[PDB]
Structures are given as structure tokens and as C-alpha cells.
């Protein structure tokens, strides 16, 4: 049950300087990137083209190439239309794609953020502001919705191209997507004292980490955030707060799908 995401981030420093950079995710694996520096969209996987032919991908990339230049001018021109209401620096962010469900089902989304706040989306056959959005965006919205050609393209991108493409990706990237890498663990410590069970190298994201005395799961164990490694595996740590000289017979048990029922138990 996977979500495809096209994260775009655009900084407009002043009247004449901007950059637009994109990264693309399928679940928690990167499939593409597009640096401002580059004329073309980069694959970060062997299967990033999906099941699209070369001719289909070139036409798709060319649409984006025209979009990026066109997007840059439009923002610049929308700032002029609104000024002095809003001025630079400005940060535009888009989050777009589709979440895939079993059978043939999917929802597509295209959400826009202005200075870090979600304000606009494409919905149905038009742009609209979401709740909380400042009412001055109604002029930008009226202007964007005048562009009939863009509406029809975006509707085709959201309704048809996204789900079709992502069906292709999941077929093409099944083995990378369904990969199983094993966690490795280690222990450590730092008037109280805090024990730390480190777990690292595991894929996919789901994992269980408890501190234990025998069978007694120490309901007290604080779970950290999922931090990434550079090789598309995950890192997590669980801390437990204890009295000094009370570390005897404490263990860290971790369960994970790659271990095949054979849990890692480390004893202090």
C-alpha cells in the first residue's frame, strides 16, 4: 500500500534570483531527483523510468522542463501582481502524486505551500485555497484557473498519468521495494543513568525494540525517532532510565521481519 510523492521546493530570493529542486519518493525509497543545475530529471534507481517507453518518458520530461521555466516566471509575475502585499524572499513548496490501493483504486493529490503554510491544492478541475488561507490568494487563484490548458494537463497528470506510472514502478522495483536488510544492535549508557539500545541497518521501517528483564517488558522504555542511514536502511534507538547498580540481567530484544523469527537479544 504505497504513496508516490513529488516533493518540489522553490526559493525566490529577490526579483531576479530563484532555484527549483525536486526529489521523488515511492514509499520511503528515492526514485528521482531534479536539481536546478540539471536540464534533465535524474533516475536514482535502475527502474525509475517504470514501464514507460523511452518516447513516453521524453515527452513527459519535456512537459516538466517547460513547467519549471514557466512556473518560475509565473511566481515572479504573481509577486508583482500582489505587491506590496507580499515580497521576497518567498518559498513555494509542492507535494504531488498519488497513493496506491489494492485492485485499481487510488487518490491523487497536489498540495501547495507558501512560506511553509499549506494554502492551495488542485481539486477536481481547478485550483482552490484550503481553510486558513489568506484571502489575497483569491486573485492568484482566479488567474491560474483562467489557464484552461494547464487545468486539462494537471487533471490528466493526476487522474491518469500518476496511477498508471506508479503501477509500472511497483512492477519494475518490486525487489528493491520488498527487500529485507537485518538490524545490528549494540548497547551503551550515560544522580540517574540512561541505558541505550541502538538498532541500525534494517529495512523496511517497521521494527520492535524493548528493554527486558527475562520476560518482563520494561514498560518505561522510551522509543526514539526513525533516523535514516545513507544506504536506504533505517536507524532507531530505545532508551531506558534506571538506578545505578540496577543494570544486572537487563537485555534489549528486537523483532524485525528480516530476522525470520530469530530475535536479537543483547545482554548487559
Amino acid at each position, epitope marked *: 500500500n504505497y504513496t508516490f510523492r513529488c516533493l518540489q521546493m522553490s526559493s525566490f530570493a529577490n526579483r531576479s534570483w530563484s532555484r527549483t529542486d525536486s526529489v521523488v519518493w515511492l514509499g520511503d525509497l528515492q526514485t528521482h531527483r531534479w536539481s536546478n543545475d540539471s536540464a534533465t530529471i535524474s533516475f536514482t534507481k535502475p527502474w525509475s523510468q517504470g514501464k514507460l517507453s523511452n518516447q513516453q518518458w521524453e515527452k513527459l520530461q519535456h512537459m516538466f522542463q*517547460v513547467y519549471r*521555466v*514557466s512556473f518560475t*516566471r*509565473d511566481i515572479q*509575475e*504573481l509577486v*508583482k*501582481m500582489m*505587491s506590496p502585499k507580499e515580497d521576497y524572499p518567498i518559498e513555494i513548496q509542492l507535494s504531488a502524486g498519488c497513493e496506491m490501493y489494492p485492485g485499481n483504486a487510488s487518490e491523487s493529490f497536489l498540495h501547495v505551500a507558501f512560506q511553509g503554510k499549506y494554502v492551495v491544492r488542485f481539486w477536481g478541475t481547478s485550483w482552490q485555497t484550503v481553510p486558513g488561507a489568506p484571502s489575497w490568494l483569491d486573485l492568484p487563484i*482566479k*488567474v*491560474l484557473n*483562467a*489557464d*484552461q*490548458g*494547464t487545468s486539462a494537463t494537471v487533471q490528466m497528470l493526476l487522474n491518469d498519468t500518476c496511477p498508471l506510472f506508479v503501477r509500472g514502478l511497483l512492477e519494475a522495483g518490486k525487489s528493491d521495494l520488498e527487500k529485507q536488510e537485518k538490524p545490528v544492535a549494540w548497547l551503551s549508557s550515560v544522580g540517574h543513568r540512561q541505558l541505550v539500545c541502538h538498532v541500525s541497518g534494517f529495512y523496511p521501517k517497521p521494527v520492535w525494540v524493548m528493554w527486558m528483564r527475562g520476560d518482563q517488558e520494561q514498560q518505561g522504555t522510551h522509543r526514539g525517532d526513525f533516523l535514516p542511514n545513507a544506504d536506504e536502511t533505517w536507524y532507531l534507538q530505545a532508551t531506558l532510565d534506571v538506578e545505578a547498580g540496577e543494570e544486572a540481567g537487563l537485555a534489549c530484544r528486537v523483532k524485525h521481519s528480516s530476522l525470520g523469527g530469530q530475535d536479537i537479544i543483547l545482554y548487559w
Partner: T-cell receptor
Amino acid sequence: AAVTQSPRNKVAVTGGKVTLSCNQTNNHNNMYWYRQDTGHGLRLIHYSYGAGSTEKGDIPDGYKASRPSQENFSLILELATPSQTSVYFCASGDEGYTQYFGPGTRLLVLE
Amino acid sequence: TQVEQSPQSLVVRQGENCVLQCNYSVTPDNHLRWFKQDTGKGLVSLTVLVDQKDKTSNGRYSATLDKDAKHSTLHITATLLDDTATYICVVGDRGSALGRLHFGAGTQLIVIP
């Protein structure tokens, strides 16, 4: 959707102040000033998105623009020159792409 | 010069047809418009083409647009004397007011009566 331009025809001397004006009763936010010289297409000088706004076009040098109101977008040549001999066209529009053009103003700047 | 017209000028006898090219490199190309301009007067719109492959008509004026070739023609059937005018090609690069219009330098028609 009608657009008017005054004057329609002007003879002026180098160093003079010339003011081409363009009135528009359609309540269009947006207005545009072009000039047409033989062997070129129309080229954008200045434009406006509303009362108070003025924006530089492709060939703004020599001209100041002025949008005092929704109705009037005025093109001001502060120190006229013979190079500014042209036929000047004004235009207006709302959010759509159509620009509704005025009838044209002929300017000759003599020495 | 992102919009080029051919011929630069042409002379035809009354009743004859003629064809006017416009080629462009403007990106993107939302729509293409053909203007008629009488000597002294200003800009009268004849037609506006919007589709990828498009065809329009307006009495004796007909026109095509192919956006892959980035090319448009204007056909005048059965020329009258009043057609003596400069004909101007214009490409708008957006479907909204955010667009710039890119103007051709014209094709000068003369119809001999």
C-alpha cells in the same frame, strides 16, 4: 470591451515632456504599453497589474509609466528623443489572455 | 525574433487566393492570433487558434496551427481590395494574463484591383 488613447497624434521637440495616456472603462486590472516600428513586431515597454503598480517590460528605457487609477495607464517620456518616434499602442485585459488594443497613438520627435 | 513571417511582402490580383506563413520558436505556445492592420489604422483580430492541431475560419479567412512544427498559415480566399494591409502573427505563451505576447513583424499584402 473598448480602450481609448489620447492624444492620437503628437509632434514634439527633443527634450520635451510627452505624455501618452490610455483610458479603459472595462474595470480590467491589467494594462500594457507597446510601440510598433517598421521591421519589428510590437514590443512591450511598461505594464501594470492595478492602480499603483508599474512594471518594466522588454524595452522600458526612456519611458516612465504611471497607473494613478484602474481607468488610466499613462506613458511618460520625460526627456523626448528622435528614437522615440513610433506608433504607440495601449492594451487592457482581465485575468484571461486576451489583450484588447487601443487605436494607436502616432508620435514624431523632431530635433 | 522568436516569431517569423513569410512572405515579407506580396502582390496579388483581385480574386486570387493567397497563403501567409508564420513560424515560431516561442515556448510554450498556448495560442496563436492573426491580426489585420490597415495602413494608418490599428489591430483587428481575424482568428485565434488554440489546439495542438487546430483549424479556424472567418468568412474568406481560414487558418491552421500545428504546435509540433510550431507553424501556422492564414489563407485568404478571393482577395478584395480592402485586404491590402499588413498581417500580423502573435503567439501568447500562457492561457491567462500571466502571458507575454510575442509579435511577428508582419506580412505586407497588396491586392491589385
